Each structure stands twice: as C-alpha cells, then as structure tokens.
Write a protein that binds this DNA or RNA. Structure first.
Lengths: 97, 98, 98, 102
DNA sequence: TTTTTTTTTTT
C-alpha cells in the first residue's frame, strides 16, 4: 500500500547515532518543519550508510529534507499508559545546508 | 520565517467508522485511522483529520474497512492527560470504492 | 551529482493495456499511461516500470484498471517516425493494484 | 478539481531566469525550469508553473542557479507545433514554493 | 492516443 512522506525542516539537536547489536547504524533526529509562526516537530529514523552520513554532516539547526514512510509502534511508559509513536523512516536525506 | 515543505500521501483501510463532530467555532471535523500495510514481514496505523465539506463527505461515504487515500500535511498536536498527537491534516480524501 | 528530492504519487486509470517490451540484455520493461481525473478533464501521465514490477503490470493490469504509482519524475529521449522526442515520464518504483 | 490523487515534490536548480507574464485577467504567472540531479543523463529538466502572489515572489527572489523546492501537481498538455506534429508536454503546477539559497 | 465527494464570499 502507498505510504510516502517528504519533509524539509531544521534539526532541533545534533543527530544521535548508535549501533544495533549486529552493527547496523541508527541515526535519529527531529525536524522542526515550519507551518504554513509555529512549527511541527517530527521524529525521523535513518539506517546503515544514510545514518552514518547524517552523523558526519548534520547538527543542531542544519537544514535538511527527508523522504520516507510513516511508521507506528506501541510503547508503554513508566506512567503505565500505552503510547502511540509515529516516526518517519527516512530512506533518503538531502543536505540543504 | 517562511513556510517549509510538508507532504504526506497514504492509501489504507479504515480501522473504525469515521467519527464526525462539529467544532465549537462551527467547523466540521472528521477523524479516522488508516491501516496502511507494511512492505515486509504488518501494518501502520496513521491518524487522519479532515475538515469542513471533506469531513461531511467522509462520514457519508466511508465506513470501517473502506479503502481510501489521503493527501495532506503532517502536524503534531499537543494537549488521558498529556497526549502528543501526530496526525495527517488531510486536504484531499479519495474514495477507492466500486 | 548529489541527489535531490524527486517524488511522485498518482492514482489513475490506464488509457490502454500496458505494452511489454524487453531490453536487448533481457530486462522486462512495461509502460502505460494513467488518466488522473481532475474532475468527473483529466491528465494523462506516462509511467514506466522494470524487472518484476513490469511483469506484474503486464499480468494484472488492462485498460481502465485503477492503479497507484510511486516513483521519480525523469525525462527521456527516443526517436517518433523521424525526429527525436523529449518526454517526461514517471519511473514507477512501486505500483499498487486496486 | 484535483479529485483523484496527484502530488509532486521536487528540489532542483533553475536552469534559466524565471519568466513572468500576465494573463488576460492580469494575474501573475511565473514559468521556470528545474535541474533535478540523479543519483548515478545525470539530471532531469522539469518545467514548473506558479500563479498569483506565489509567482511574484519567484520573479523577485529566484534567479538562474537558485535552489528551489516546489510542491504541486502533474498537468499534461498537447499542442501542434509548426512542423504539424502533435507534441505532448508534462509540467508541474507548483502550488507551494520554498526558497533555499543563503 | 487516451480511463470510468467538488458550486458563490456577492459593489
């Protein structure tokens, strides 16, 4: 089924890079997309080489554009309430700089 | 400063039947959840929101299990005590019925 | 050549059956034109698909079939019965059958 | 109309300076061309169109070589040239435009 | 070369 997202925002913090147990790179960051002035804070996830590149070139405030899909996943917080997360599985990231 | 790109396009089935209510300011608002299938081994559940006439059409022609595609922007709302809502503000809703 | 954002998504009906060709090296390529209605006027976009996706288009899509495409927007050069033409097509990375 | 689903998002460089004309109604119309790079022909030439205030800002802010991001629809066209052959044209109806240069 | 839900904003 069709599922496509395209965003252009500024990173709110430095991209946070980590590695899975079996070595897969995982870069995460939060784009602040200006509204059509407030903005929306969307969370994005990157994998493998695209994640390592996000780490070496993006930082707080950098302008960037993502292209991916919307994901959801259940979560149980310390307060007990079940939370719904929505992320952007960015398959491509353009550095606008 | 100025605006920034923000576009979303989904095609999924409604988990429930769309719920229509009228805003205190008089505007119509219909909500519904699309279940778009994942491309691998099973589905994501995106919250959609549409307004005014597009909302009145959704409530009349879409029900649970209906296939539909939306075209809007991704916005994060904030307000069961403190919920961080991530939803699609649907500007268009296409009915994929017979 | 650093990459840039290039995304297209459409839902339309084939103007005719998809024509299946084969690359000199043996790759499957299927083309078709989608009629994306503005109203019930329409736009007629040309789409190309490759490898397994061209196989499925050829097997599961005929004229008037509702289909969704997701891909890039690329230009192309070829010859019709004379001078060259400069077309703009949609490289369907994924095609949903409806 | 824009009833069935149809959306385009592009980011490219202007190949030529924008062209601003005015329609019978006196409304603003801006036409420009983007060079959308490939990821290993190495770029794609896409024609764009915008209207009204969105077209005024294009002619003022954007010049040849500027980096721009458009969001709109696909719209087709067919005309007969002087050679007597029916040409077919696709171009983006840029609803939204974002300026990206420094 | 074409396929088969939407309306005004009113001097």
């Amino acid at each position: 089924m069709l599922n496509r997202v395209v965003l252009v925002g500024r990173l709110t913090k430095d991209p946070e890079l980590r590695y899975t147990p079996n070595g897969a790179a995982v870069a995460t960051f939060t784009l602040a997309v200006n509204r059509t002035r407030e903005a929306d804070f969307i969370n994005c996830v990157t994998w493998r080489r695209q994640a390592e590149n996000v780490a070496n070139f993006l930082k707080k405030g950098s302008l960037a554009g993502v292209d991916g899909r919307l994901q959801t996943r259940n979560y149980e917080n310390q307060q007990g309430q079940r939370v719904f997360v929505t992320e952007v599985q960015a398959e491509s990231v353009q550095f606008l700089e």
